[PDB]
Subunit: 114 residues, 2 copies
């Protein structure tokens, strides 16, 4: 019931398939990265959309208190927005065990740690 | 009188001095990067501050129409805010002639093109 928790469980399998995979990095185009990450939380009834460099979240069921706790700007329990970079940092938190995460408006780059 | 124009004129000299400079990359900690970039526009009376993952701009003199044109959310001609990533992309536009620009909450990395 915390939608951000769904990221600790979803593999980087998503990002592997969608990205360009090298020995020591994976590069994922931004729209494909965001599409995959948005789809993860769609199962708790949380809808996500990008407009500009902001991510907008809204939910019919689940409260978004976890997103607010992590920095999102919410108008109520069911509607929040947050910068693209904050969204990327949140959803890749578990991937940081194995990868440096960096990005720009074009793409997300995960570099194997070492 | 367009404050974003001041970036086309300010060298990467700033970033070299503040960063860790290697043969094919420069890595600049975020607070030092933003401090240098904020200082650039301070000369047209534009004040800049980071809070969360947002950059807040306000000006006593110069209008901020150029920032608005580039995506900033403005309450009037003299007050705007924009996501950190959008700010980074804007201020490094001229550096993109020589460098890939990428970043995260920790630091900005410029990789020599080639
Ligand atoms: Cl954990
Ligand atoms: Cl857009
Ligand atoms: Cl130009
Ligand atoms: Cl802060």
């Amino acid at each position: 019931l915390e939608s951000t928790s769904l990221y600790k469980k979803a593999g980087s399998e998503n990002l592997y398939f969608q990205g360009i995979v090298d020995k020591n990095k994976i590069v994922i185009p931004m729209s494909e990265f965001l599409d995959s990450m948005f789809l993860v939380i769609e199962k708790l009834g949380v809808h996500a959309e990008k407009k500009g460099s902001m991510i907008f979240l809204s939910s019919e069921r689940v409260k978004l208190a976890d997103w607010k706790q992590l920095g999102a700007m919410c108008s109520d329990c069911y509607h929040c927005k947050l910068p693209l970079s904050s969204f990327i940092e949140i959803v890749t938190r578990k991937a940081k065990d194995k990868f440096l995460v960096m990005y720009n408006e074009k793409e997300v780059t995960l570099v194997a740690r070492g």
